[PDB]
Design an enzyme around this catalytic site. Structure first.
Site, PDB file in Angstrom:
ATOM      1  N   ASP A  36     -15.807  -7.026 -13.207  1.00 43.84           N
ATOM      2  CA  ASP A  36     -16.268  -6.045 -12.231  1.00 43.84           C
ATOM      3  C   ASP A  36     -17.545  -6.520 -11.546  1.00 43.84           C
ATOM      4  O   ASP A  36     -18.153  -7.507 -11.958  1.00 43.84           O
ATOM      5  CB  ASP A  36     -16.513  -4.696 -12.910  1.00 43.84           C
ATOM      6  CG  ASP A  36     -15.230  -4.058 -13.407  1.00 43.84           C
ATOM      7  OD1 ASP A  36     -15.310  -3.157 -14.270  1.00 43.84           O
ATOM      8  OD2 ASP A  36     -14.145  -4.457 -12.934  1.00 43.84           O
ATOM      9  N   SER A  37     -17.946  -5.811 -10.496  1.00 47.47           N
ATOM     10  CA  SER A  37     -19.150  -6.160  -9.750  1.00 47.47           C
ATOM     11  C   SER A  37     -20.396  -5.957 -10.607  1.00 47.47           C
ATOM     12  O   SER A  37     -21.394  -6.661 -10.445  1.00 47.47           O
ATOM     13  CB  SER A  37     -19.249  -5.321  -8.477  1.00 47.47           C
ATOM     14  OG  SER A  37     -19.005  -3.950  -8.747  1.00 47.47           O
ATOM     15  N   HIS A  94       0.827  -1.201   0.000  1.00 49.93           N
ATOM     16  CA  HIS A  94       0.000   0.000   0.000  1.00 49.93           C
ATOM     17  C   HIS A  94       0.865   1.256   0.000  1.00 49.93           C
ATOM     18  O   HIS A  94       1.896   1.312   0.669  1.00 49.93           O
ATOM     19  CB  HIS A  94      -0.927   0.006   1.218  1.00 49.93           C
ATOM     20  CG  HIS A  94      -1.751  -1.237   1.348  1.00 49.93           C
ATOM     21  ND1 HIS A  94      -3.125  -1.244   1.226  1.00 49.93           N
ATOM     22  CD2 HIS A  94      -1.390  -2.519   1.590  1.00 49.93           C
ATOM     23  CE1 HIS A  94      -3.573  -2.477   1.388  1.00 49.93           C
ATOM     24  NE2 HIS A  94      -2.541  -3.269   1.609  1.00 49.93           N
TER      25      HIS A  94
END
EC number: 2.3.1.251
Length: 170
Positions: free
Chosen positions: A77-78, A34
């Site tokens: 993708d969702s 990150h």
């Protein structure tokens, strides 16, 4: 076991590996770093579940100490959406002395993300990657330079060398 049996057995594996080049590679999520390192509390108030995708691609070698890098994958993708990616560049992989399978090096590959729209058309992108592994264990590295704090991240994914992976029949 036999004399000729042992020969044809090895010659078949060595001849098939030299006659039929280009292997079907595949990668998938594993571990990533990150850069933000901020307290995410905007779009993550509750547990969210996101879909995954499949990684694939191939590689080539040049007599001039060159390592062709080609990527091929698709993410879902969702809200239903396939994102095709294609990489193309050059990488320099160094080989050991006694060993051979173990390879270590780096390079630069440009990935192209396609998209169906009248504005978000397929656009290329520059992203440096690296290749380090041995045998059935391939490590895919990728960093994204920038300035200092927002430009020094590292990525790590799994990679396996297989053939076809669709059907055999024989």
């Amino acid at each position: 076991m036999n004399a000729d049996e042992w020969m044809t057995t090895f010659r078949e594996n060595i001849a098939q590996t030299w006659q039929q080049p280009e292997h079907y590679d595949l990668y998938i999520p594993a571990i990533t770093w990150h850069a933000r390192f901020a307290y995410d509390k905007e779009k993550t108030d509750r547990y969210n579940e996101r879909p995954w995708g499949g990684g694939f691609g191939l590689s080539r070698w040049d007599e001039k100490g060159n390592w062709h890098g080609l990527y091929a994958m698709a993410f879902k993708d969702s809200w239903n959406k396939w994102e095709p990616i294609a990489g193309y560049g050059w990488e320099s992989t160094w080989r050991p002395l006694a060993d051979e399978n173990f390879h270590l090096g780096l390079g630069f590959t440009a990935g192209v993300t396609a998209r169906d729209n009248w504005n978000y058309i397929p656009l290329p992108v520059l992203l440096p990657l690296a290749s380090v592994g041995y045998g059935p264990v391939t490590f895919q590295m990728t960093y994204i330079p920038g300035t200092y704090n927002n430009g020094n991240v590292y990525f790590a994914w799994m990679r396996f060398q297989f053939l076809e992976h669709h059907h055999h029949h024989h």
